[PDB]
Amino acid sequence: KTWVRYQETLTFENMAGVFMLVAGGIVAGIFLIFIEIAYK
Amino acid sequence: NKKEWNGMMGELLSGQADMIVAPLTINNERAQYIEFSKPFKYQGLTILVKKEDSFMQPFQSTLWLLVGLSVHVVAVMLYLLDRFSPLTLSSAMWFSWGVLLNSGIGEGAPRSFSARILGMVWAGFAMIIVASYTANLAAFEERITGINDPRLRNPSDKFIYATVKQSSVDIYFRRQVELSTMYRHMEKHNYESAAEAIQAVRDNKLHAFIWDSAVLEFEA
Amino acid sequence: GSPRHTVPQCCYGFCIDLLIKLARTMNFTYEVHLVADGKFGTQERVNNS
Amino acid sequence: STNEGMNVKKCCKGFCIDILKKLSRTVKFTYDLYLVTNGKHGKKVNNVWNGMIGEVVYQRAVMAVGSLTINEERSEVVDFSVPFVETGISVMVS
Amino acid sequence: SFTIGKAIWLLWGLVFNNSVPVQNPKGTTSKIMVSVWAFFAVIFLASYTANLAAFDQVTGLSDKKFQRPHDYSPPFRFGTVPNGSTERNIRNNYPYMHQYMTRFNQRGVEDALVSLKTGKLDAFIYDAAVLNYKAGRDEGCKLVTIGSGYIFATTGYGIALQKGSPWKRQIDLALLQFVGDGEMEELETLWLTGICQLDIDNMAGVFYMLAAAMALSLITFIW
Amino acid sequence: PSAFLEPFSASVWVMMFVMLLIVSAIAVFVFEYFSFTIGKAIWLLWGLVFNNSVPVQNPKGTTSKIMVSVWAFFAVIFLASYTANLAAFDQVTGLSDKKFQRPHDYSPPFRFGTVPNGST
Amino acid sequence: SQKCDLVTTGELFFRSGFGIGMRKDSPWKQNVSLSILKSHENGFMEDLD
Ligand SMILES: *[C@@H]1O[C@H](CO)[C@@H](O)[C@H](O)[C@H]1NC(C)=O
Ligand SMILES: *[C@@H]1O[C@H](CO)[C@@H](O)[C@H](O)[C@H]1NC(C)=O
Ligand SMILES: *[C@@H]1O[C@H](CO)[C@@H](O)[C@H](O)[C@H]1NC(C)=O
Ligand SMILES: *[C@@H]1O[C@H](CO)[C@@H](O)[C@H](O)[C@H]1NC(C)=O
Incomplete structure (x- = not known):
């Protein structure tokens, strides 16, 4: 009784590649937007 | 060429000890040398472990290019129907990427007297594709469970199991002749005390540890 | 159900082929008649004695 | 139709053949290896064995160098050596 | 303002709500009907996702699947080999399991292997390490056992001699010499192996219905 | 299911504010190159997640609609991951259950007892 | 195997x-x-299954 009975989508490592590919897609989209602005 | 003992039995046979108040393990060698008493503790062994998404790149890239070529062909044939009526190309691309956008865009409605059917079928087609994608993403080994495991007979750098150096549990594992490979695995990671084993398993350096049951229940 | 209506019909199946195999092994014939009721049989008390 | 047959010579390799060759190197005896023609590993059908148990127990073979499982009936009819590998039972599924 | 006869596009664009503007609703009745139809579309999409969500096997020797697979809809079957010690191990363990094997009999080792490769067999009780070898030499790591023999019998092999053979002690000493120097580990390393969401028909049928939709759009375009 | 700390975990929220600041700076740069999206870009960017925002008239230079579509696809896959997190989030079958040995297969443990020194 | 509503229980x-x-003591029981x-020793139940 005194010893035995007496008791008392992670986005850290899994979605790291998710963050890397989303950031790469964002950088590619921003590059396409600035090329579209510099063209027209 | 004499076999001796050490620790508590090294002091008992040499006169530096008279009464061992300790969890002494009953086996063949210690019962024939010294006398035993009534066993007050009934306790067994157990294994201490550490029990604590194919989006685009692990997912196969055939249907993504298929949807891209599909929306390209849809935009081309809607632009050709806008040519053959029964910023034109920019508004056509805006409509074709705003139907698929599925969140809200500041647009209008193009002249679709013979093209509203294609737009409504493409809208339902895009939503049933993303619904099936959500469905089959939502619908879609650390434990050891004993000593009878051939995965531990062929270990690796992940299947790490050890025991206390110079222990009676190691004597019982050495006595059985079919436990040679696990003995050779545990002798490479010999640990002195139990607190060092707890510190090693806490810092993600271990994956299994043979230890008595009630002590780990108290630690749990 | 019926007072008296028993006609010659065709019997086959699993036990009939077993009996044909038994008649093929040892040289004997048979004669299949059907049971009247549809009960297996228990130890029933009769109304007399 | 009958028990007529011919003596076909065939080559053997593998794990138990390596065990047989290492026993022929260590103990230095001449092996008389032949495949069994009665059947599989063994099952007693009305005091009639078959396979390696039927060859060893009925005084037609001396020993079983090849792979042979251990149960109660084979511990009763003959005696085994020390174990060297843990090959239990499992279930292959699709 | 096209709700005279052309309400089909507006109505089935408000089913999925893919950001398709149509008109500015000034009537209260129209917005109430659109809100009720949108709530119906939301609960219909919830029922559709519930239908899509509702649409290791044996984890022990005392499992109910060995009795009957009634817990699930597809049934399975299994069997062992005749004239072997595995059947005697089953008869010593459970004669009920021997009668389960007697109902679902089979031919042999290679026949059960062909039945596993072609799909004519679900489960097959065999040895522990030999099925691991067959899984390792399997092309593509397909045939994988449930575990590797955790709470199974875990038996071993040996060398059987005659009762009273004087050559037994020398063979025992030779086997103790072969095991206790790493030679048996070399034999177990050399002569063993070490190698070992998506659907097809549904979007194909959706593609057939899409081809029918393109045919109907071509019919409405030519007339 | 009292409160969830799994998707954002108070570490990704800083990246949400950084992306809001970047989209606001891009909107200021486009408005300088060229309409309430000068300092109010938060309601226009984060408001397009729950697909009932007010339609804002995009410029004709094909600038805002591409990043709106990218953020819309990000919101769709974020809601898909949220539904997957919700989907991933009788007790005792009998004597054949693994709970009688140890309920370590599940998260909560339990306990049981009979009469002391009895026939049970 | 005939219908789609007949599933046996556990x-x-x-x-x-x-x-x-069989009947009582008679010489036509041993054969x-x-x-x-002879039906036991071969595949007499397997082909009928
Ligand atoms: C079968 O026929 C033979 C004919 O000689 C005879 O033994 C007997 O009449 C029959 N009985 C057996 C052996 O089935
Ligand atoms: C016996 O008597 C009962 C009526 O008490 C009747 O129904 C039955 O047919 C009779 N026959 C027997 C022996 O059961
Ligand atoms: C076992 O071996 C015997 C021959 O000794 C053979 O007739 C039988 O078919 C085999 N298997 C069975 C089903 O017992
Ligand atoms: C049939 O049974 C008799 C004993 O009643 C026996 O003597 C005879 O050999 C048996 N014949 C065959 C073919 O089994």
Whole structure:
């Protein structure tokens, strides 16, 4: 009784590649937007 | 060429000890040398472990290019129907990427007297594709469970199991002749005390540890 | 159900082929008649004695 | 139709053949290896064995160098050596 | 303002709500009907996702699947080999399991292997390490056992001699010499192996219905 | 299911504010190159997640609609991951259950007892 | 295998021996028993299954 009975989508490592590919897609989209602005 | 003992039995046979108040393990060698008493503790062994998404790149890239070529062909044939009526190309691309956008865009409605059917079928087609994608993403080994495991007979750098150096549990594992490979695995990671084993398993350096049951229940 | 209506019909199946195999092994014939009721049989008390 | 047959010579390799060759190197005896023609590993059908148990127990073979499982009936009819590998039972599924 | 006869596009664009503007609703009745139809579309999409969500096997020797697979809809079957010690191990363990094997009999080792490769067999009780070898030499790591023999019998092999053979002690000493120097580990390393969401028909049928939709759009375009 | 700390975990929220600041700076740069999206870009960017925002008239230079579509696809896959997190989030079958040995297969443990020194 | 609504339950007990109900002491029982044993030793139930 005194010893035995007496008791008392992670986005850290899994979605790291998710963050890397989303950031790469964002950088590619921003590059396409600035090329579209510099063209027209 | 004499076999001796050490620790508590090294002091008992040499006169530096008279009464061992300790969890002494009953086996063949210690019962024939010294006398035993009534066993007050009934306790067994157990294994201490550490029990604590194919989006685009692990997912196969055939249907993504298929949807891209599909929306390209849809935009081309809607632009050709806008040519053959029964910023034109920019508004056509805006409509074709705003139907698929599925969140809200500041647009209008193009002249679709013979093209509203294609737009409504493409809208339902895009939503049933993303619904099936959500469905089959939502619908879609650390434990050891004993000593009878051939995965531990062929270990690796992940299947790490050890025991206390110079222990009676190691004597019982050495006595059985079919436990040679696990003995050779545990002798490479010999640990002195139990607190060092707890510190090693806490810092993600271990994956299994043979230890008595009630002590780990108290630690749990 | 019926007072008296028993006609010659065709019997086959699993036990009939077993009996044909038994008649093929040892040289004997048979004669299949059907049971009247549809009960297996228990130890029933009769109304007399 | 009958028990007529011919003596076909065939080559053997593998794990138990390596065990047989290492026993022929260590103990230095001449092996008389032949495949069994009665059947599989063994099952007693009305005091009639078959396979390696039927060859060893009925005084037609001396020993079983090849792979042979251990149960109660084979511990009763003959005696085994020390174990060297843990090959239990499992279930292959699709 | 096209709700005279052309309400089909507006109505089935408000089913999925893919950001398709149509008109500015000034009537209260129209917005109430659109809100009720949108709530119906939301609960219909919830029922559709519930239908899509509702649409290791044996984890022990005392499992109910060995009795009957009634817990699930597809049934399975299994069997062992005749004239072997595995059947005697089953008869010593459970004669009920021997009668389960007697109902679902089979031919042999290679026949059960062909039945596993072609799909004519679900489960097959065999040895522990030999099925691991067959899984390792399997092309593509397909045939994988449930575990590797955790709470199974875990038996071993040996060398059987005659009762009273004087050559037994020398063979025992030779086997103790072969095991206790790493030679048996070399034999177990050399002569063993070490190698070992998506659907097809549904979007194909959706593609057939899409081809029918393109045919109907071509019919409405030519007339 | 009292409160969830799994998707954002108070570490990704800083990246949400950084992306809001970047989209606001891009909107200021486009408005300088060229309409309430000068300092109010938060309601226009984060408001397009729950697909009932007010339609804002995009410029004709094909600038805002591409990043709106990218953020819309990000919101769709974020809601898909949220539904997957919700989907991933009788007790005792009998004597054949693994709970009688140890309920370590599940998260909560339990306990049981009979009469002391009895026939049970 | 005929219909799609006949699924057996998990309960299966009283697994007795179904055979042939024979008469009393008679010399025409041993040959029948040898024929049944001849059916046991070969694949007589397997092909009928
Ligand atoms: C079968 O026919 C033979 C004919 O000689 C004879 O033994 C007997 O009449 C029959 N009995 C057996 C052996 O089935
Ligand atoms: C016996 O008497 C009962 C009526 O008490 C009747 O129904 C039955 O047919 C009779 N026959 C027997 C022996 O059961
Ligand atoms: C076992 O071996 C015998 C021959 O000894 C053979 O007739 C039988 O078919 C084999 N298997 C069975 C089903 O017992
Ligand atoms: C049939 O049974 C008799 C004993 O009643 C026996 O002597 C005879 O050999 C048996 N014949 C065959 C073919 O089994």
